Assembly symmetry: D2
Amino acid sequence: MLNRVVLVGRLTKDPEYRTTPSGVSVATFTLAVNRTFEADFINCVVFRRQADNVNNYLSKGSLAGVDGRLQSRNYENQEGRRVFVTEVVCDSVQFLEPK
Amino acid sequence: MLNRVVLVGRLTKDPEYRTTPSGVSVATFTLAVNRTFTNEREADFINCVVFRRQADNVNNYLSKGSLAGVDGRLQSRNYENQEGRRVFVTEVVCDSVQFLE
Amino acid sequence: MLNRVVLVGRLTKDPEYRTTPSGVSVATFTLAVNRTFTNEREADFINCVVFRRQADNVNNYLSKGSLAGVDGRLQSRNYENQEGRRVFVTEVVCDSVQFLE
Amino acid sequence: MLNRVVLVGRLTKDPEYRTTPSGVSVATFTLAVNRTFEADFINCVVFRRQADNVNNYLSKGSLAGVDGRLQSRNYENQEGRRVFVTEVVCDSVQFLEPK
C-alpha cells in the first residue's frame, strides 16, 4: 500500500547515530518544518551508509529534504513508560545547503 | 517549507466523530498501511485526524476495515497526561480522504 | 533534490507490456485521476511507465479500468518524431504500483 | 482521487506571467530537478496572488520547493501542432533561498 512522506525543514540539533533493537545502525535527526499558515517537529531515521552522509553533511540548523515513508513503533522508556512514535524512515536525504 | 503525506490503507476501527461546541466536525481513525518490503510483511499504524466537511464524509462512509486514501500533512503536538508525564504526539492531518471501496 | 509523485486512478486501457532484447520488462499505461475540485468534475490523464518485476505484475493483474496506486518520480525526455519536430515528454516512472481492486 | 507531487529544484530561467485560455492569470516557471543516480525539467504553474510572490522572489537559478498536483492538457501551438503537456499545478511554492 502507498506510504510516502516528503519534508523540507531545518535540524533542531546535530544528527546522531543509534542502533536499532536488532543491532542495525541508523542516523537520526529531528526536523523543524515551518507551516504555511508555527512549526512541526518530525523525527527522521536513515539506514545504510546514507547515515554517514547525514552525520557529516548536516548539523543543527541545516536545511534538509527527506523523501521516505511513515513508520510506527513503540517501546518502554527509562522510566518504564510505553512511548508510541511515528517516524520518517528516509529513502533519501537531500543536502539543500551545501555551503 | 514542505510537509506532505500520502497514504493508502485500511481503518483499524470505525472512525470516531465529534463536534466541538464551536461547531467544527472532527473525525479520527488509525490507518493500517501494509509495508511493501518483505520482512513476513508487517504494517504501520498511522493516527489520522480530519475536520469539517471531510470529517462529515468520513463518518458517513468509512468504517472498520474500509480501504481509504489520505492526502495530508504531518503534525506534532505536546500534552501532559493525568500522571504528569509529557506525551509527544505525531498525527497526519488530512486535507482530503478518498474512499476506495 | 526531491521528486515524488503519488497518484490513485484508473487505467484508461490495458497496460502495454514489452521486453527489451536485453531482457528488461517494461509496462506503460495512462492513469485517469479524477479531480477533487468541482469545475462538473474533470480528470487528469497521466502517462506512467514501470520496469522489471513491477512491470511483470502490472501486466498480470491490471487491465482497462482497474483502480491502481502509483508511487514514483516525474521524468522528462526529448525526442524527434518522423516529421522532424522535437517532442517534449513528461511521464511518471513508477517505483511501485499498488493494485487496489 | 489522490494526486500529489512534491519537488525541489532550481529555476532554469526567470519566472513569467501568462493567462490561461479562460483569462485566468498564472505564474509559470521550469524547475531543473537533479536525480539521485542528470536532471528532469518540470513545468510548474501557480494560480492566485501566489503568482506575484513567485515572480518577485524567484529568478533563474533560485532554489524552490513546490507542493501540488499533476494536471494534463493539450493545445495547438503556433505551427499548428497539437502539444500534450503534464504540468505541476502548485498548491504552494516554498522560497528555500531567501538570501
